[PDB]
């Protein structure tokens, strides 16, 4: 919960190995920019030039540690950013400093952007007194999910149980191939041999209702209109009481009030990751000394 | 250059290693959802719900190929997409189709989204009467460059070693630095004197960063009059809105950051439609 | 649950990568024995010389497929093996068959041995009238996790709330790090508001009660003797019906009925993976000219 | 032979990549446990709750060194383990200690179980006055051979010719493929212009003699009963005194004295790796911060 | 051209990953040789027993650093070696020292044998008055590109290339280069292999920066390029194929700008090095 | 022996991984060259422009089999090549065929040059009435070791003595680390309970006689002039043991006959892999129907 203790969430080995691949991706051969740089001791200042939330310090750190550079932060992880802010200093050999600059900035930029979009969107949820949770989707970038998931958590959103946990989602496609929703749900509880929580993706009011009577614990109301969403939700908590309702599909920071309803527990926003602009950063080398 | 023959731009072996990496990332553990759906033959339709350019077919196929699934495309690669269009059909064992579903869609969503974004950058520069080429930057998602650069290519967007303004500060002076790269270029700048100096001891290109449109053409003018051999690039704060203001009589390339940093993904989905 | 339908659980790409690394581990140099054997087409019989459950056909297949060989099974995945049974036939070039013999047999032997031990434990507990569930532990051979999980499943063992990823496991060591159970459970609940499955591992009746009071959804009773376990479960279910009681530590196939009890939900057995002797299989050719 | 220089056998870079992959397998995603425990400096005690031999210090060390943790040993590698013995201390940040607990414990359990089984068998053949040597087999767990070979050696089992120097192993499948042992052994020697060591697996006294008259250097007497094993080895040693006699198949620690004999050189026991119970070890924190 | 800052060309993380697979390749199983030697602190001397250019220091250092050993270099990267020269000292446990020997000596041998041959050819072409660059090719050992590309660089050697087979597969020397600029967008340069002047003027017409004239004989090669550098001035012309240390003067000419030789990587003897333990603890 | 069936020695999964890494190294980024050629069914012919021995078909095939192309060979593996020779043709999509050109040619060139140099050295030493064997060494290119060791075998040099000869090598760096050849040879023997051959590497006549007195089976005479080698070798007969003599050190084709002597049993030439010029091959497209 506390934004700063969350650095402890990232597993050191797979994070080291994930930063290793990125470094390899970007310089596959001889680095001629080093020959201009020299290997003289140097320093750079990291300027944040965008409003938002700051997230991604552990990835930033690990990248420069791999190049045996050191980094000193003046804002914590989760600080509000007010443009043109000194956030950090980086020290090490010039050529290693400039090797790690792209990857590092690029990583911080998008991580912060997704924390920033997430923060905005939870401030919109409390704005309309809504007392459910804002969540992300699995609509992440192949190869980059550790970073994006961390951003959502920093900016206050939540990883869906999809990998924050494990709930056996049934998508319509599951429903289609299983032969209807009832079949797919006992096949969903066939496997897990305990009080499981099963969730169904539902595109229409009829689908939602069959799913609940089939005994699902969450109903996902996908790509509904606010007009038809709340009537659908109200019935399904007159159906069963423990059935949570989740809303995804076409939800944006502006029109999110329209989805915050008396009768929705969760809102998943695909744009937290698919549409979030990257925060603007730059690493300007200050002195050589 | 064919709207649809650039799928050949990808080396097959590196593609399968990239795909394989993505798939093991997604489902390390056992796949219980496979039991829900079973292994019966199946088909799904790829639907495009956004406007834009289509991009990333080769990654899409390599995913499903690695899973023993075949793919029929109904549009060329790089064709335009007007919403709720049927883009393709994917066939194979139900559980293998669902296994590839999100890596494929998330991949195709971001590739198209960048290509879409490039296309708008070149169409506004084409329409605002300007010669040259619109390029991307290196502001890419780590571990995802191959996808993102292919996406620029398909969208119509645009050597030696580049020298940003930190190699200059590190090597001491622009005059000493240009040398330093040539001893074995796009020098960066924040002033006019620095852009004139940039071409010395033999330099070949320039890149102006975070300049107002009004302040750049008097810089730009004096370079065809310095040594006409060097091109001039504009960079920084170029967006879809403010694109014509940065096009100039003496601006050869315009590389923007927001075609990859601020380019929303396109809405796709994949529905199964008949199952036996 | 349907035993041939269990093959569907192995993710194909990581199954292929796993098989590939085994073969590389086993023959990285020059294969001189191929000179003795030639490449002529051949056929071999798989013989089961041990009693138990057959488990591991998907690994066996994959191994021989990367060697361009073909397997026909006579028993389905999950069968009871009655010693000296002709279980399968393997067709391909002589040298490719012998190249896969060792990794294939060692894989099949170790998986089946785990399924044989699990099936015997599921039925020992069945036989005593216990409606709880036998599960396996996380005490697995590093690198062989996927095979060993699959073996448990073919034999009837269960899968835990973990792996599914919807459970924070606070062990004794976490308690001590956190200052005690009450603080430990609260930090665990604050990992994220919404995935409230906290299991607390406990070594005394008092420790279980505090965990139950602090809001623990499961209680792992560790290394209790049967005459300590049963009273402890009985009072916990008397005062905390919604908490689930899982017992582990010290359980064998011999004493397992002693550990069944009407208030034990899950018995997880380390021996299933840590002392499950491997079954005996062999693979012989029967024509080559 | 002396068990503490045995650690010198492990190649550092291969060992590190092995430990690196095991860790990645065990925690590929976010580590919510860490927030419960924090990152304060801690100390855990390694307890040995089972009788046997203690093998695996190099793997246990490498696991924790990659998590920037330290180990102090109180017992040398190889030393006998008397139940409930305090065998090591591990110092580090709390969450890093618990990140390594499971893999380190599971690795040490297996390696020690195998060394324990080897040592019990080595000693049973020494009390019985046998001049021969007990060995393991290639019947290891895939991807884990490095630990299991090491376990065998610390327990006192011997190396084969596939370990030191070369060997062509003509298994009974190779006899059938070449069509005859004379044809199989002479194909084997064709693998080099220099003197080879060729071992033929034999299932009967007939095949043993045919193997020896064929120029076999070693003879693996697979699965004889002791009534046939001793006349066979007595014949071989008399009339082919240069031939080495190895026995394997169906050997147990109980019947091992029946397979000893003055003309058996080596006894490869498969159970040493497929029916060797892991030792029970635990890692308990004993203060934090 | 820098002299000893060329160590900085090599990207550190790619380097340790590469050295890593070299060590896992050489030592898959158990290390029985360590029981002979032990782990006592010790010290070894690197000997150069061959004349030539010394190249490969970053690889040598990387290999032994991975084994927790230390290296002291007595000669800078790029020196000429005259034999029996004492070039370095390596420090660390006895078993870790010998663990790195075979992959350390092999890498150095190849790297410095290829720098040697680059120097020998750079000199020979210099002795013929020729003022253009001597480059290597891509006929490298597979998996070893980085080490060989660095070797040539230490030795003094040096866009999209349309080989003869892209002329055939496109269907004309002419259409290949314009389908080459097609999606290249002015971003990359175009070089084209040719076996006659017909072909050469075609590719220069169509705006190809460089012409490579493959397997011409020196009579034929020199009037070719004179004629060619005239019609289109800015087209740099390269000759290659069948070029050796000895016949290199016959391939140097007023109008050749680059000479690629495949001997420089496919026929570059390794240098003789050795690593002997001394004055032990 | 039979060079045609030594393809059997190559393990298929290791071959495939090796070939993948080379393909990865050769095409790191986009292949714009592929746009010029296209993906139409075409074919090329493989031209041996150089004389020698043909070796390396399995790596050639494997490369093009990874790329979805097929190879028909007109000469068997191991055949003396006469230049102006058409050796094979290859069919596939154009861009794929040209994607495999470079790596296939470089590999076949280097393998065949190593084999050609080995065949030369074997024939030359037969021509001098010498009956020892020519062998290669482990001076092999890292990452390429398999191809070089194979080529050696194809051309008739032993590359596998330390894989198959029951042989263990005691370098003179061991002798020094162990302090005297007396204990180097004793430690080398300690590791095995079976008799093994020990080869000691000597730089002088003193070192040689001490190694034979120590019990060495082979003595490697390293870097002797021919002038000092053969007196040294004749003298060791003083031992008269089945003590073999091996010569090594700068033995090239141009000086090999001077090292052939009646008291030299093995000659190992590092230049067969360090200084073996590569054969000239080209792969030219002809028709595109």
Residue numbers in the entry:
A (entry chain C), C (entry chain B), D (entry chain A), F (entry chain F): 1 to 289
B (entry chain D): 1 to 158, 166 to 191, 198 to 289
E (entry chain E): 1 to 158, 167 to 289
Question: How does the study describe this entry?
Answer:
QPRTs have been shown to exist as dimers or hexamers2223242526272829.
nearly the same in both the apo form and the substrate complexes. conformation even though the apo form, which may hinder QA accessibility. that QA binds to hexameric apo HsQPRT with positive cooperativity.
